[PDB]
Design a binder for these strands. Structure first.
Lengths: 98, 124, 155, 63
RNA sequence: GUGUAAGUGCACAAGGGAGCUUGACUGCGAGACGGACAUGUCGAGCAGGGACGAAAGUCGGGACUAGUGAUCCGGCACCUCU
RNA sequence: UCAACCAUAGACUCGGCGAAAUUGCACUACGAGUAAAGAUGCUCGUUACGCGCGGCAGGACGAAAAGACCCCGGGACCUUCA
RNA sequence: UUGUGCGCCGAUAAUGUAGCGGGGCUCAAGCACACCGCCGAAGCCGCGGCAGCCAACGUGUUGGCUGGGUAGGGGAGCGUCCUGCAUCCGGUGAAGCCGCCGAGUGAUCGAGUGGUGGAGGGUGUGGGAGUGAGAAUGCAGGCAUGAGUAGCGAUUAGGCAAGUGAGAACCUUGCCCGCCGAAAGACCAAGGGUUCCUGGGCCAGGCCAGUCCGCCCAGGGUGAGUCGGGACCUAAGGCGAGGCCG
RNA sequence: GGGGAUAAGCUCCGUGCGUCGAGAGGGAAACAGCCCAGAUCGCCGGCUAAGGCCCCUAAGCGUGUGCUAAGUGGAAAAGGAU
RNA sequence: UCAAACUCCGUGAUAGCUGGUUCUCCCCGAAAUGCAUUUAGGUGCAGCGUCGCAUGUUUCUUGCCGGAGGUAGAGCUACUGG
RNA sequence: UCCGGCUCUACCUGGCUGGAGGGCAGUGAGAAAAUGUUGUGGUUAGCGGAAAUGGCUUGGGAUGGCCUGCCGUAGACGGUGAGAGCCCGGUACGUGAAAACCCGACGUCUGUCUUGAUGGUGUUCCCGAGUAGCAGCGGGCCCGUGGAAUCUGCUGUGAAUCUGCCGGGACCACCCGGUAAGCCUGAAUACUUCCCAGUGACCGAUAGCGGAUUAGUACCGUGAGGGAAUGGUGAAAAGUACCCCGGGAGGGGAGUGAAAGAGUACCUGAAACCGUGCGCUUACAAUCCGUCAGAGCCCUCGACGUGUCGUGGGGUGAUGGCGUGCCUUUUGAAGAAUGAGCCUGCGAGUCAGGGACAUGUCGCGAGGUUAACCCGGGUGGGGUAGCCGCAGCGAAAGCGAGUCUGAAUAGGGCGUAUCCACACAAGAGUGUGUGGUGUAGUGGUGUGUUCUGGACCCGAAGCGGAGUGAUCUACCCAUGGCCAGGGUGAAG
RNA sequence: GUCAACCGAGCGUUGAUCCGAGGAUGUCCGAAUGGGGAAACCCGGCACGAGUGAUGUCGUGUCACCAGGCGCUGAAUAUAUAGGCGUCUGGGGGGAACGCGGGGAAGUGAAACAUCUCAGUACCCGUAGGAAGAGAAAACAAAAUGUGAUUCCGUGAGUAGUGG
């Protein structure tokens, strides 16, 4: 309540659009944490990630190439990004998505 | 859990009403009436503590001045003279002299007579 | 709002001379409602498992370093309680006023024996806690109890 | 019980990554027949909330 | 005299007149004013695509300030959004 | 005009029983003035032996009633082509 | 004739001087210009104690600046009750209350002692609050001022002797007197419920007192073929089998 | 500076102007806003401001030179007057 | 008691309204203005306060240099009007 | 499984109607009644139950202090002449039921399948009708008529039986799931008039249930309905025998008693308030009633000396100066603005909640923490469903340390913890690419504000629902009674 | 028994007082129920029995209402029915909360207010039970090769959304 003048929450426009209730939010992992919790490299699945504690339990996972990559990893996820495709291509690994 | 309040009040009541033995009427029996008068009383004591200085100093001056004027000098010029002469005695003690020993006071009077300027109303 | 009565304006608003009143059970009366009173409430608070266990381990350490944790196989001879036995044995083993005893469930005879003593405050190690430890001066574990405690925590 | 949220403040106020508060701007819907385009163009986008109303808006959004 | 009230300006013309003409555009906008808040005002400069002009360059309405009304709810055209 | 006298119930005195509303205090003067603009309580002056009784009724902005006229806010009830 | 410094008249309201604050003052105690001193405040200084901010140093010392304060913000504390834990006093007298002597910068304190009195309390650390009253035309109880004042309930009017009695204006009797007399007399209904009689009684009550009373206690006492009602009848109206509507 | 009658203890604006509010103490006869001055507590210590020194009231019926005759001082106009 | 009784309950109705709100010390310490307002006695934001962190003299004062103003004043055959 | 008869009928088969061994089940929701045994199975009374007349002192009384012993499957609690493990009552523990009641247990009793089943194979018939559906008004579902499904109420209309029908948020086609309009169904869950046993950082006589006291009583109201007040002798009444004053109350002695400063008005026994004595002071004086100075008198402690000052202290205090109650609200109140007669007791920022934000503290630390619940005589262990963080931009698809707009690397917006070091470009305000330093959140708790709730306390006028009231008064009905006495003199 | 004493008179080891379970008696009003009624007080009938020279009186029982079953009759009126008569079993009212179905507000908040909210709460009705109601898919879901009656708790979620 603001005296009587039409408040901020009644004189500003509403935000535009909707939500698409059927949106699929993915849960991301970045290659930095791969290199920071896989010295030996190797196979990396959803459960291998859940172990180190980088994502949630009911996750639907995505992979992203922020950090450096020199370790070799046979990553398994749902969907990737082209930066991870290329970074795995350069560090010589298996980007075998699902 | 329930806390009767009796003691925690009785304390200050006892205090105040002890401190008002001499007052006259409802100022000497009743807490709601003696509390007020205690406010006024302590306040008037404070004020009088600051002002009895001026009271006594007034008194001392009247005594000094009458003593001097019976020795045929004014107060103002007496103090001019003692200031000039660097004499240090304060007024409480000048008055004590006036009461007890007027001879010594007359001697001091004479000192000031000696040490005053010649032409008191000069432009210096 | 729970007292008896008061649900009638006891007299007029005006003309009377006296004050304004709306119920005969309001706080300023004599018989009237408590205002902000006690109420039936819970006092539990949710301390976590890690803080609790840290407390207990630290407490047992405080006693151990000062050599107040004694062990024992049993307090009694076969299957007949006799408090005189346990009292003499605690006299052998201890002179302090108060003491804790940790005896399991099945070994009921030691419990039934040492229960009645003035100082003692017996416990099962499944409900081992901190107040009961710290209030004591000495602590008497059974060996079964130690083994259970340790192979229950350590894995 | 819980602290219920304010519909309008949720529908006309969002938060970014670093905790900023964001709104849109006014005089955009109707009577555009005479509003020059530059005036129509500084009103697009979003805008960070003022200082003075940040607190009020926090209290509306959260509870 | 300046389309319309008054002021500030205009002869270096922003007054008067003639020829082409649609920038009375689209996508933006550094930095600033004023500022309870929402509003409000100017804005060089970049890009496409143009007008005028020989070119330089000017044109994102009118000599400037007034000429209109937030939000919600609906309506019309277009979209490779659901 | 123009008021006078008389008798009874009271009122006054004595014996008995014995309340009340009201009340910040108190050994509670007057004047000219100052002040929230009408002072028992302040200033400057004047007057006054302490304590009571009957009586008057100028003040104590006297007692009674959280103004009934006015204004604001909320209600109520009444009306009408709201 | 100009300009000046003091002056005159104009001048004049109602409770009482009353337009110096008063007495009084021109033998200025009045105005002006210079001069000399002095009084004067919780100001400044001087001697001391506390405190906050900063700084320097050393295992909390000193120094400079600072310290009015309502709405209000922040910080640090006393006290009361119940409790966890450890210890101390207590029928060789706790608490509580009245005190005296003393203390703390303050809320307050006395493990400092006396009187009264008769069974629980204190201390340190933590916990939790129905946690501190002077005001709400505040609530409950008690007691004051008014006050030993107004009143003591009609317009009929009381009196003398004797009586019992501790005690008599009033209670019992005697003779007077006076009042109502279509009522202030005698009889019923409603209504009340022992108030009626006897005996005893007077700490409460009666607007005084009281041996008295509709007051107190115990006991006693109300008798119907024909009286007013029922068992006899019905009006207004009620209830209402079945019933109809909802 | 506006309105008002260039009246109001009137009303409305300005002001790195003030004080009161929230601020005591001294002076102003008494007197929230005026002048001085911004209270840590104590002292039977001293110096000063504003103001004032005949008595009430502590301090000078102070010094010098002139005016005042009206109790001016200790309210007042247009105007009048050897 | 009647411009729509009384009792219980909803109900501890609600009041931009009046009153009242209890122990101590230490430090700092205001405002009474602006825009809006079914609003003017209330409230929201800005203003002035304190607490904590950050930035360190950026604030303030005095001097000197640089800048626009159209006020007092004055002036008018330097315009508009008398 | 055997047979008895039956398939109208004698005969071969298929199909029924009976009994029999048997099995299954049973007081089940699935049919229903009683039966008699029956369990130290349970409830409805109870009972036993260990160990000090211990010693000295105090005291009226020892249950106290100190010193000696003991019991303990019993040191929980209470009472007893003062705190009692060893006095009493009772506890830990074990015992106990003729009768009735409840649990199952049985054998009765009752049915019930047994005359049977597994599968084959091609087509007709049935699969819950005034219903489902559609239209019109309406209810409630997150959903306020909206594009508004599903569930539904009243009217009106009104279909099919498996290539049938209903749903998967209008609708249509495909796929999916399911088979309405007939019916019953325990366990988990909610609640306490009453009863039994206990617990309390709950009250302790103005509190706590309104009610410790005759309490829904007395009293009030016609009536519904409101609705109070009053606890304590002492260890045990040993409750003052007796005498004196008095009419009696009441009291003084004598007594009881540890104490009558315990007398049935009684534990203690405050203040207001009411008085009696002792000292000072007060009748020429103008007083928010005090304060500063202080004469004089009276009391007291101490050093001394025939009475006497003092580093004194206390009560009164002539006289002088100064001095305009308290609170609230007000620009401003000593205020002739409000409130308060006085005392005593009672009376207002509280609680909940993984609520929100900010901040202290503690654990953990790129991780943190559990909820319901289960097990636990207790406060403890477990429980991964969940939530917060760890990447955002965008209306959305979507992309991703970048992304959105846009034709655009061409500028901008948002984001990439922050700083640090070197570069290149400009000084249109700095940017861009590298390198390393490496990111801190979460759960308890305390404080403050805050949201929802009566939300710091008291206060209306008045709105609504259900009932009580015409014995007063307004009007009407039914039925009775009352209106002295004297005048005028209409119609006929 | 007791507040609550006093007095009187007694009982009890042959087992009292006291406690528990079952029985008996159980005046009158009350759903109240023979009829009536101002609640607890007035009048009766029928069968039997007691009693008086007979009447009066007394005692024991029983007699209301509806719903259903059975039995007899079948009025106007022909079938035959409603109805009438007898018998048998049920129901009737009270209760502190808890439940299910139905009805169903208002002050309040919105700083006014009608839509909305307060609340389908309070209250009212009809019926229950020891618990109730719901309950066996004409359900969810999303192409996962899934789940498999219902209810109550935790979360999802103060979210998707709805809304002058």
């Amino acid at each position: 309540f603001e005296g009587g003048q039409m408040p901020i929450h009644m004189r500003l426009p509403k935000l535009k659009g909707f939500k698409n209730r059927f949106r699929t939010e993915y849960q991301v992992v970045n290659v930095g944490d791969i290199n920071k919790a896989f010295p030996q490299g190797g196979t990396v699945g959803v459960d291998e990630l859940v172990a180190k504690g980088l994502v949630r339990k009911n996750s639907l996972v995505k992979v992203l190439g922020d950090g450096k990559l020199t370790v070799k990893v046979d990553v398994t996820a749902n969907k990737f990004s082209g930066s991870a495709r290329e970074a795995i291509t350069a560090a010589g690994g298996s980007a075998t998505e699902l | 859990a329930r806390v009767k309040r009796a003691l925690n009040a009785q304390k200050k009541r006892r205090t105040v009403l002890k401190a008002s033995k001499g007052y006259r009427g409802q100022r000497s029996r009743l807490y709601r009436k003696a509390k007020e008068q205690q406010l006024h009383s302590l306040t008037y004591a404070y004020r009088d503590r600051r002002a009895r200085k001026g009271e006594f100093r007034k008194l001392w001056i009247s005594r000094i001045n009458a003593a001097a004027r019976a020795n045929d000098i004014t107060y103002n010029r007496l103090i001019q003279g003692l200031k000039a002469a660097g004499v240090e005695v304060d007024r409480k003690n000048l008055a004590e002299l006036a009461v007890s020993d007027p001879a010594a006071f007359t001697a001091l009077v004479d000192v000031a007579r000696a040490a005053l300027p010649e032409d008191v109303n000069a432009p210096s | 709002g729970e007292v008896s009565g008061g649900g009638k304006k006891p007299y007029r608003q005006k003309g009377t001379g006296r004050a304004r009143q709306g119920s005969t059970r309001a706080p300023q009366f004599t018989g009237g409602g408590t205002v902000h009173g006690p109420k039936p409430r819970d006092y539990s608070q949710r301390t976590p498992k890690k803080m609790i266990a840290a407390a207990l381990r630290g407490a047992l350490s405080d006693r151990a370093r000062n050599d107040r944790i004694h062990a024992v196989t049993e307090l009694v001879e076969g299957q007949t309680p006799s408090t005189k036995s346990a009292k003499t044995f605690l006299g052998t083993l201890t002179e302090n006023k108060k003491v804790l005893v940790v005896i399991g469930r099945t070994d009921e005879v030691g419990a039934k024996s040492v229960r009645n003593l003035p100082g003692v405050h017996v416990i099962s190690p499944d409900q081992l806690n901190t107040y009961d430890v710290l209030n004591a001066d000495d602590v008497v574990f059974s060996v079964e109890a130690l083994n259970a405690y340790i192979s229950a925590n350590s894995k | 019980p819980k602290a219920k949220t304010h519909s309008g403040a949720s529908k006309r106020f969002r938060r970014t990554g670093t905790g900023k508060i964001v709104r849109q701007k006014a005089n955009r819907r109707h009577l555009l027949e005479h509003k020059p385009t530059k005036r129509t163009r500084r009103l697009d986008g979003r805008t960070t909330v003022s200082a003075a109303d940040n607190s009020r808006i926090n209290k509306l959004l959260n509870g």
